[PDB]
Design a protein around this ligand. Structure first.
Ligand code: CLA
Ligand code: CLA
Ligand code: CLA
Ligand code: CLA
Ligand code: CLA
Ligand SMILES: CCCCCCCCCCCCCCCC(=O)OC[C@H](COP(=O)(O)OC[C@@H](O)CO)OC(=O)CCCCCCCCCCCCCCC
Ligand SMILES: CC1=C(C#C/C(C)=C/C=C/C(C)=C/C=C/C=C(C)/C=C/C=C(\C)C#CC2=C(C)C[C@@H](O)CC2(C)C)C(C)(C)C[C@H](O)C1
Ligand SMILES: CC1=C(C#C/C(C)=C/C=C/C(C)=C/C=C/C=C(C)/C=C/C=C(\C)C#CC2=C(C)C[C@@H](O)CC2(C)C)C(C)(C)C[C@H](O)C1
Ligand SMILES: CC1=C(C#C/C(C)=C/C=C/C(C)=C/C=C/C=C(C)/C=C/C=C(\C)C#CC2=C(C)C[C@@H](O)CC2(C)C)C(C)(C)C[C@H](O)C1
Ligand SMILES: CC1=C(C#C/C(C)=C/C=C/C(C)=C/C=C/C=C(C)/C=C/C=C(\C)C#CC2=C(C)C[C@@H](O)CC2(C)C)C(C)(C)C[C@H](O)C1
Ligand SMILES: CC1=C(C#C/C(C)=C/C=C/C(C)=C/C=C/C=C(C)/C=C/C=C(C)/C=C/C2=C(C)CCCC2(C)C)C(C)(C)C[C@H](O)C1
Ligand SMILES: CCCCCCCCCCCCO[C@@H]1O[C@H](CO)[C@@H](O[C@H]2O[C@H](CO)[C@@H](O)[C@H](O)[C@H]2O)[C@H](O)[C@H]1O
Lengths: 40, 42, 194, 161, 60, 170
């Protein structure tokens, strides 16, 4: 079926297990920057 | 834009000076970012 | 007789509302100088490449071909890491696609020499999805708009990859703002060089 | 190596060229204070000099007894980046300019007044022509073979002799 | 030839030898050079027209 | 024969009151030399910049965005020179001014009023009569704001106080 156990498609999560907004230090989203800009 | 001023900018000395200044300008910019190209690098 | 896109300018000639996305936008009057057939061929070509390029940046963020040479999440690093033989293979294949799909009428003097030739119509419909005449107007409109959007989006993503050395999705998810200490624009002649 | 020359990366004369070229700039830098604009300018010149010599050493260039790079242009593929490949880039651009200008003079002959098109250039048409040059080897060879590049000898004005 | 036709010059000392001009008029008298040919190119003298004989002129 | 504004001066030949806000005031004779269309383009553009700037002053003392530091408007000019946002604003003004160059070419070609960008999103102009009334008001406000912004910046240069704080003090 092409590819194979050795050398198969690499699918990775860009999100890195954090939300779009309301995040901690490890994740600063673009919307978090909007929220940080509004509250300062 | 005026058609006679565009026909003036289409004259041979204006196009020659603009084209060779543009030509000189990208030779200058290419030798600015990538200087000392004595050879094709390979 | 004013433009609908730019209401204070006159409606440009060679723009008559026949083409998809013909909203009357040509302030600089390039269509008065350059034949609208060539400009629509070039607009469709830029947009189609950009639609793949935008999808390329996002999909290369999510999925990779296997192997260490294809493991570059950030898209501008994939340019350097990907095997040169294969990237030049892509380039040569693109050149072959350009000569066959344009049918050796490639220049601005001989593309559209055939009166049957239509701007953007390279004969590309492998699954005959344009077999229905009714969808043709919507599809051509939605292709043009998707193309324009993807031109703007890919341009953004590249220049956001330059500013922030981060891939677009993980630049949105790990956003760090512009400090302005570095990435200053211009300045080659202000300091007189150096 | 080739022609009794030495690779620039291991020749001592190239190294003393780099060292002398940097000493000249360092003695000019020795008369300025650290943050001043001339000192910053001179240091960037030193950086450029070091980058040039560092790049030339690892490029496969061959130096002489004088410590300067020498170009081998006999056709060998280990040195094709000094003349054969830059020459191919030139001939592509030169044939581009020639094909584009030839196409414009043939256009201008079919004008209402041919000589105004050469002092007042029809810029949209001439830009159509400058775009034509990217496939000039094929365009010009098809032009040659289709009897459209070469005119016969009996269509050319010649002196009585 | 006839008036208005395009003609190739066969006079070896002509400026426009083996070039194309167009015939303006042809005299009917005992004229030595009746074919008057006008040319797009101008000569070194600036003249752009000259009279030629029939045996110095061929239709194209 | 004579000017409506200056009774003892003659009315300039090129000033026929066609442009709203005309009162015949042109002693130095700039309309006898230059195209009035271009001059009304320039008057409305300078005035619109000045009106946006006088509102710019007043709002910038009253409020500033939380992401930007609190500071005086001339200090804001220098900060955004060094920060990058000034270059942003200059780029986007320049981008709009490209189509402004096209617009001025449309005016010179006779096919556009000197200040018209057909910018009426909120449909405030109802018919021709109110458009003329608003237009006279716009030119009067434009001229008044040109004088006002010069006062606000010059007063700050002399006394290092903002316009609202200068009214508040003294
Ligand atoms: C026909 C003769 C001839 C030839 C073959 C060259 C060839 C070259 N010159 Mg020379 N040059 C010439 C005449 C010539 N020049 C003349 C007449 C002058 C005096 C005006 C100069 C003055 C001159 C200087 C001062 C420099 C060159 C440079 C160069 C290089 C250009 C590469 C480049 O632009 O990379 C640009 C980068 C790209 C990515 C493209 C190349 C080795 C430059 C160089 O690299 O020196 C080795 C350089 O700095 N040339
Ligand atoms: C503008 C188009 C464009 C360009 C220049 C590139 C360039 C590249 N890609 Mg990307 N890519 C693209 C679009 C593009 N991609 C699209 C649309 C997708 C989604 C299917 C991907 C998904 C993708 C993955 C998953 C990976 C790359 C990778 C790479 C690199 C190595 C080449 C390779 O293995 O490709 C692989 C290419 C594919 C799997 C699909 C690309 C083919 C698309 C559909 C174009 C097809 C059009 C084609 C010309 C036929 C149309 C002809 C007709 C209309 C006339 C290189 C930097 C690798 C890399 O280093 O990134 C980390 C890698 O792992 N590409
Ligand atoms: C004449 C035919 C030919 C031959 C013999 C080769 C040979 C090679 N290629 Mg090249 N290649 C070709 C045509 C060819 N290529 C064309 C026409 C293209 C452009 C579309 C490419 C693009 C290309 C890339 C981008 C890469 C190679 C690589 C390789 C090498 C490793 C191959 C390997 O491991 O395969 C075994 C692996 C496979 C069979 C995996 C296939 C992966 C999937 C099918 C890709 C998805 C296709 C995608 C949807 C593209 C659609 C667009 C297309 C229809 C136009 C090998 C030297 C690679 C290399 O140099 O690595 C060292 C590499 O990175 N090739
Ligand atoms: C004036 C005499 C002269 C001439 C005309 C040439 C001409 C050539 N030499 Mg030779 N050469 C000469 C003297 C000469 N050389 C001398 C005195 C030496 C020193 C021993 C060399 C050493 C030399 C080497 C070592 C090589 C050449 C090669 C070449 C070719 C360059 C690329 C090419 O077309 O390959 C053909 C390629 C194509 C037609 C298309 C490629 C794209 C070309 C035919 C190269 C070659 O290809 O050998 C045949 C090569 O490897 N030359
Ligand atoms: C929509 C198009 C667009 C884009 C992509 C940008 C992009 C940018 N602008 Mg610009 N800008 C634009 C339109 C745009 N501008 C327009 C139309 C105006 C009005 C004239 C401005 C006025 C402007 C100012 C005044 C400033 C920027 C700044 C910035 C930077 C913001 C840094 C960041 O991401 O964190 C911020 C994230 C957010 C605000 C989230 C929402 C970035 C370079 C700022 C900067 O620091 O430049 C270096 C800055 O001070 N921009
Ligand atoms: C349709 C596609 C639309 C493209 C839009 C372009 C977006 C980016 C444009 C610039 C963004 C903001 C610039 C601020 C950045 C800026 O203004 O920096 C300033 C820089 C000059 O440096 P200074 O004198 O400002 O130094 C100032 C000191 O403060 C620092 O030393 O201006 C330039 O000349 C740089 C641009 C290159 C000029 C030539 C470009 C290449 C010419 C190609 C042919 C013409 C193309 C158009 C030329 C204008
Ligand atoms: C022409 C033009 C346009 C265009 C366009 C553009 C820009 C098109 C770009 C097209 C692209 C990017 C095509 C990419 C093909 C990639 C391939 C075949 C990958 C093969 C991987 C292989 C063989 C492998 C391997 C393996 C190796 C060696 C070792 C392992 O450790 C790794 C691995 C396991 C993976 C369009 C269509 C828009 C419009 C118009 O018509 C004009
Ligand atoms: C996928 C991917 C990559 C890639 C790639 C590739 C092949 C990239 C090629 C990308 C292309 C073709 C980009 C073209 C963009 C065109 C634009 C922005 C048009 C702008 C015009 C505008 C805004 C306008 C206008 C106007 C009009 C209409 C009317 C006028 O009167 C006036 C005006 C001028 C104002 C890389 C290599 C990075 C690797 C990576 O790993 C994966
Ligand atoms: C025609 C044809 C068929 C086909 C086909 C194909 C290949 C169809 C594929 C069509 C595609 C690939 C369409 C993709 C459009 C992408 C767009 C519009 C993205 C715009 C991005 C934007 C606006 C952005 C942005 C962003 C900015 C800058 C900030 C970033 O931080 C993040 C963010 C991403 C948000 C087939 C072959 C089936 C057969 C058929 O018989 C005929
Ligand atoms: C930098 C910055 C911002 C900003 C800003 C901006 C863009 C400000 C723009 C300001 C502008 C464009 C001001 C324009 C002024 C023109 C004047 C006063 C004309 C005077 C002519 C006269 C009196 C006359 C006359 C004549 C007439 C007609 C007839 C003639 O025959 C005779 C005569 C010569 C007498 C702000 C301020 C928001 C704050 C921000 O934090 C930082
Ligand atoms: C340098 C610089 C800056 C700047 C700046 C700027 C925008 C400076 C702008 C200065 C301006 C607009 C000066 C003009 C003021 C108007 C005058 C003098 C007309 C008065 C009326 C008169 C004379 C007569 C009126 C008449 C009378 C008698 C009454 C009737 C009416 C009339 C007949 C017309 C920053 C802020 C960017 C900071 C940075 O550091 C660089
Ligand atoms: C079946 C073939 C039908 C047509 C074949 C004709 C081919 C036309 C010219 C082929 C040129 C080959 O192109 C050349 O080969 C491969 C392609 O990845 C590259 O080789 C590179 O990748 C391979 C694959 O892992 C490595 O083993 C190798 O060490 C590395 O240098 C070369 O850098 C490239 O220069």
């Amino acid at each position: 079926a092409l590819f194979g156990k050795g050398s198969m498609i690499v699918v990775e999560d860009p999100r890195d297990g954090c939300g779009a907004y309301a995040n901690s230090g490890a994740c600063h989203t673009f919307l978090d920057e909007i929220g940080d800009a509004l509250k300062k | 834009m005026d058609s006679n001023f565009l026909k003036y900018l289409s004259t041979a000395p204006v196009l020659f000076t603009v084209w060779l200044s543009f030509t000189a300008s990208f030779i200058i910019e290419a030798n600015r970012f990538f200087p000392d190209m004595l050879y094709f690098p390979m | 007789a004013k433009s609908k896109a730019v209401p204070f300018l006159s409606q440009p000639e060679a723009l008559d509302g026949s083409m998809a996305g013909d909203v009357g936008f040509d302030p600089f009057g390039i269509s008065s100088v350059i034949d609208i057939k060539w400009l629509r061929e070039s607009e469709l070509k830029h947009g189609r490449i950009c639609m793949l390029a935008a999808t390329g940046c996002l999909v290369q963020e999510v999925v990779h071909l296997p192997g260490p040479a294809f493991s570059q999440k950030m898209a501008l690093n994939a340019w350097a890491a990907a095997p040169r033989g294969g990237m030049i293979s892509i380039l040569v294949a693109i050149g072959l696609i350009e000569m066959i799909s344009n049918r050796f009428a490639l220049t601005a003097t001989d593309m559209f020499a055939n009166p049957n030739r239509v701007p953007g119509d390279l004969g590309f419909d492998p699954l005959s999805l344009g077999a229905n005449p009714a969808n043709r107007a919507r599809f051509e409109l939605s292709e043009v708009i998707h193309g324009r959007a993807a031109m703007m989006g890919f341009s953004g993503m590249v220049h956001q990859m330059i500013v922030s050395k981060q891939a677009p999705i993980e630049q949105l998810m790990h956003f760090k703002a512009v400090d302005s200490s570095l990435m200053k624009l211009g300045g080659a002649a202000g300091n007189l060089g150096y | 190596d080739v022609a009794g020359l030495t690779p620039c990366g291991e020749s001592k004369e190239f190294a003393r060229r780099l060292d002398g070229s940097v000493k000249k700039l360092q003695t000019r830098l020795s008369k300025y204070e650290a943050g001043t604009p001339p000192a910053l300018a001179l240091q960037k010149q030193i950086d450029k000099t070091k980058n040039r010599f560092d790049r030339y050493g690892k490029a496969g260039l061959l130096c002489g007894t004088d410590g300067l790079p020498h170009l081998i242009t006999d056709g060998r593929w280990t040195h094709s980046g000094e003349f054969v490949i830059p020459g191919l880039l030139f001939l592509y651009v030169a044939g581009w300019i020639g094909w584009v200008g030839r196409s414009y003079v043939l256009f201008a002959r079919t004008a209402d007044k041919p000589t105004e098109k050469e002092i007042i250039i029809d810029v949209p048409v001439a830009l159509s022509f400058v775009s034509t040059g990217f496939i000039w080897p094929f365009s010009a060879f098809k032009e040659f073979t289709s009897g459209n590049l070469i005119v016969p000898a009996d269509e050319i004005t010649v002196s009585p002799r | 030839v006839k008036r208005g036709s395009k003609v190739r010059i066969l006079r070896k000392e002509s400026y426009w030898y083996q070039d194309i001009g167009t015939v303006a008029t042809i005299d009917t008298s005992g004229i030595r050079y009746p074919v008057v040919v006008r040319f797009e190119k101008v000569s070194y003298s600036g003249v752009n027209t000259n009279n030629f004989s029939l045996d110095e002129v061929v239709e194209v | 024969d004579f000017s409506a504004a200056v009774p003892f001066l003659k009315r300039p030949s090129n000033l026929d009151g066609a442009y709203i806000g005309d009162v015949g005031f042109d002693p130095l004779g700039f309309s006898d030399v230059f195209d009035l269309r271009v001059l009304r383009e320039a008057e409305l553009k300078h005035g619109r910049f000045a009106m946006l700037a006088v509102l710019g002053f007043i709002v910038q003392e009253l409020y500033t965005f939380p992401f930007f530091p609190k500071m005086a408007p001339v200090d804001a000019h220098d900060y955004f020179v060094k920060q990058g946002g000034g270059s942003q604003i200059i780029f986007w003004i320049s981008f709009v001014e490209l189509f402004g160059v096209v617009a001025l070419f449309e005016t010179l070609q006779g096919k556009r009023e000197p200040g018209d960008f057909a910018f009426d999103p909120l449909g405030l102009a109802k018919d021709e009569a109110t458009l003329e009334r608003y237009r006279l008001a716009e030119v009067k406000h434009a001229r008044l704001a040109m004088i006002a912004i010069g006062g606000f910046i010059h007063q700050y240069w002399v006394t290092k106080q903002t316009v609202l704080e200068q009214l508040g003090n003294f």
